Amino acid sequence: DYYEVMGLTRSANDIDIRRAYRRLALKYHPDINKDGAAGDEFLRICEAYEVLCDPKTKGFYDLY
Amino acid sequence: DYYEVMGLTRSANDIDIRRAYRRLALKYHPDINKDGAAGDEFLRICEAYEVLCDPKTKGFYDLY
Amino acid sequence: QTPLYEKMRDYAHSNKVQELLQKMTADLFIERPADPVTWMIKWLSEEQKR
Amino acid sequence: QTPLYEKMRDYAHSNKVQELLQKMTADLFIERPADPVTWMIKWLSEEQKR
Amino acid sequence: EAAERRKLEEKERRMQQERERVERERVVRQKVAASAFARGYLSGIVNTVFD
Amino acid sequence: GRTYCAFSIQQSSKLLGTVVLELFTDIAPATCANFIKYIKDGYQGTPLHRIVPNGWVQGGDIVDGSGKGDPGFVLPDETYSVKHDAPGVLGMATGGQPHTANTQFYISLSPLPFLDGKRVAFGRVLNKQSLENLLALQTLPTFQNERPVPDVVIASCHVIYNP
Amino acid sequence: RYYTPYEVAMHNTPDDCWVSFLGGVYNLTDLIKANQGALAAPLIAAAGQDLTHWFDPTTKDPKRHICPATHIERFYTPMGRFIHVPPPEPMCNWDTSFGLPWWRDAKKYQIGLLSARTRVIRVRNVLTDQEDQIEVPCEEKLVEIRERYLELNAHAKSYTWKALVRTHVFQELDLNLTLEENGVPDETPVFEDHHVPTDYFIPVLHVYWNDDL
């Protein structure tokens, strides 16, 4: 899901999403995290934050 | 006055009050409508509906 | 995390398993048996020929 | 929402079949056989023995 | 036990460094803001003077 | 020229009001016949089950009195001709699927456009006193999950003005 | 007691269903057992999930709104109609004889209490060197930390604990005081706020042996 990948829950706030993306995308960035199982993880982190940082897309996803 | 901001005639059913609130709010919400005038109008609508929804407060205001 | 889920997503969203499961569930709902497990045994037995 | 559709939803969402499906799919995505038709047969045969 | 105490001391030193980093980040952001705003308002002031 | 029937509403040995109803014996005759046969034998102590604030006052179960279906009869769907647009429209209620109607009845308390064509409406309230009695029954002191905390009961029920 | 979110996640099946909402962990198994229809679907599909978004804080009932179709106020149930929710229109099968909604019947359907936060403790067995990271609620007495660690050593009761309390010296820890009272602070918020990985430093608990027989 777009939520579990960030680690948050379904009732996360806006600051909650900011903090979750902050830590998860400073832990998995290619220039910082050299290698591992961090190829798909960073891409889904970016996609989840992009979906969940805009209220219209966020709500449209939440209903479906 | 309160019935004037939503175009209420002091003789309309509660259903019409609900429709007025829904329509005006969804047209005037601060998110959907980037407009400070819309923001203060939405504030007025929220206060008016809050004081016009409760039957006890409805009578308390009507006696004024 | 992404690796454990991806290994299962890639398996489960591949055609053989998915359009086996969908037809099995469809026929299970159509038949409405008392005990589903032996009915699925049967259905898989006479579907193994195909 | 004809009485058939409602009856199917009641059967589809029942406890027995839904938990059985959840169990089977979890086990199948664990083992990951390249021929799920036969693995399902053996798995259901061993389940039915209990 | 000595290894653990050394590790904890290292963590404390790193956290002191990070607090210094955050403080100077805030200070430089304030510097750049207080230059940009000053220019962007003196522009309007001198435009009004010309008018 | 229609038939008329009345019943009383009482909460915990306190008379809360009375209501009189006209029955559309010219629009849906069989539904009125069943309703009068059950108000003559039944409804004498059946609680008001479901009470929606701006919706309807429901109730009238017989064998259980608490909202589960009853055996012994099933009522077919007669007619969708009376339209739910004004308060005080008495009608019968059934499951989602038609031709399962039972003694469960409901009286509207607001315009209800969606119900038109789904529920058999075959009566009306007669005056303003009864409608005000229902509208006052809305704001009981405490009612838990859409049921009055004490038993709001039909104490009496009778038929007047017609055979 | 208490439960980490992952611990709640372990039970997701119509045979053992646990849900966490409003800080409470609920074992809804007997509900799903007694109400097996299309009513049980929206919470079966969220077995082991976090259900706080359904409800609101001010009252324990689910969120409500003015229904657009009928204009009558009723529960907002986008997921679907869960058990103990009335139908939108007057039906003939929804009884109201039952006592209390399951989100209000805490005494019969609540076990334990959900942890608002969790932390990572690195436990080190000093006799036989065996490091182990573990996650425990950030507010729990050392007795239940020992209970969590009992799955690592079946003889952890005989062992004695020690922590790098403050300079800094490895000192004894009282069992009835939580990890925060005993002087083992939590710094992951500062770690995050200062761009330091939350797995860079972990607080450490040494576990010495106490000879017995």
TrEMBL record, chains A, B:
Coiled coil feature spans: none
Signal peptide range: none
Protein name per the record: Uncharacterized protein
Organism, as annotated: Chlamydomonas reinhardtii (Chlamydomonas smithii)
Residues of the full protein shown: 6 to 69 of 346
TrEMBL record, chains C, D:
Residues represented out of the complete protein: 17 to 66 of 70
Protein name stated in the entry: Uncharacterized protein
From TrEMBL, chain E:
Family named by the database record: Belongs to the flagellar radial spoke RSP3 family.
Domain of life: Eukaryota
Subcellular location(s) of the protein: Cytoplasm, Cytoskeleton, Flagellum axoneme
Residues of the full protein shown: 208 to 258 of 516
Name by which UniProt lists this protein: Uncharacterized protein
Annotated coiled-coil segments of the chain: 1-28
UniProtKB/TrEMBL annotation, chain F:
Top enzyme category: isomerase
One Pfam family matching this protein: Pro_isomerase
Gene Ontology cellular component list: cytoplasm
Catalytic activity, EC: 5.2.1.8
A GO molecular function held by the record: peptidyl-prolyl cis-trans isomerase activity
Alphabetical UniProt keywords: Isomerase, Rotamase
Keyword Isomerase belongs to the record: yes
Catalytic activity: [protein]-peptidylproline (omega=180) = [protein]-peptidylproline (omega=0)
Protein family according to the UniProt entry: Belongs to the cyclophilin-type PPIase family.
Functional description taken from the UniProt entry: PPIases accelerate the folding of proteins. It catalyzes the cis-trans isomerization of proline imidic peptide bonds in oligopeptides.
Protein known as: Peptidyl-prolyl cis-trans isomerase
Organism: Chlamydomonas reinhardtii (Chlamydomonas smithii)
